């Protein structure tokens, strides 16, 4: 069955002391570490690349690395992030031109490496635009952006939860992640809509006790399912 | 007067502990911290962006930040890096269409921010193209790549030093930087050729005593009659 999975986004931490901040999250009991990769083209900012991820792996050998590719050409980054230690790689439907064969193929390329494959969609991208992209275990996870990607600290877009609901109805066993404006409040409607994987940035690094907050989030997800 | 300037390249540090490693280099007496910004389009790698640089600035108030933009659209990154605390910004001739007027305008814009402006060239680009650009007094530095940009640890391309020699003859007072494969051995031909600003990555972060390596490098530059 679906597991509750909480993933602090490191982009929200002290970017010059990533290992220390990631270790805090790991010690506070996070499930995954969400690593946003931005190339300055697909979104207007540049975050960090494979070198940062690889360096983190060196310090956190058992942590689960969830790599989110907000880049123009995801195919070019599979091998570098696989070698850096990614356990899951998510790419955007819009990065592969909404091309079903390009997407299905990239997912298998990721899976061949023993890495989970996720497919992401931006707010303006309608869930129906995916067609059968999520059919037949093409993907291990769907990421529904709940804010415009590329920036942290934005306000949760509840209207995006309809995509989650629809996805959950069709794929009862599929991991569905939400990313953007998740905190102790917004996790409720998100879980209710069917999301079981939560990316939390600003709320998690600002939290008084990150552990309690992650526990609360899991509890909310477990209660919805 | 030309000074020897050594700039450890943080791309070669423990990127997950940047503040800590950059602080080591500062304590070892580095002149500048060289920050390679790669967007995965202009070069086949992504390094880090303004957020990382800004975070580093918060920890190192007085360090000189030398930002090297290996990006497709440098015009869009000038203010973000000025805000992040850059003391110098270098952009590529190839990023501005090898266009003289574009390069000049971008440099003037960097300078208006009270920031030093640098112009960089990839190995395949012939130095002749940059002639007038550097004479225009819009640039504070020339960066000659001595490896194909994108990654650390590559082999120094000695043939690239001809560009350094030509540049040094024409512009005796211009800071000339080299980047790619600089170490205790390669710094000698580089300094003889006229480079006074040295970016060192792998060699610097592997050094048992980086303070001494940096000092050795300044000694080499001083002895080269570059100054
Ligand atoms: Cl573009
Ligand atoms: Cl590949
Ligand atoms: Cl010295
Ligand atoms: Zn993300
Ligand atoms: Zn550089």
Residue numbers in the entry:
A (entry chain A): 4 to 228
B (entry chain C): 4 to 230
Lines quoted from the article behind this entry:
Toxoplasma gondii is one of the most significant parasites that impacts human health, with estimates that as many as one third to one half of the human population are infected. At the Center for Structural Genomics of Infectious Diseases (CSGID), the first Toxoplasma Structural Genomics Pipeline was established. The enzymes selected from the TDR database as small and tractable for expression and crystallization included: phosphoglycerate mutase II (hereafter referred to as PGM), nucleotide diphosphate kinase (NDK), ribulose phosphate 3-epimerase (RPE), ribose-5-phosphate isomerase (RPI), and ornithine aminotransferase (OAT). The genes encoding these enzymes were cloned, proteins expressed and purified, crystallized, and crystal structures were determined.
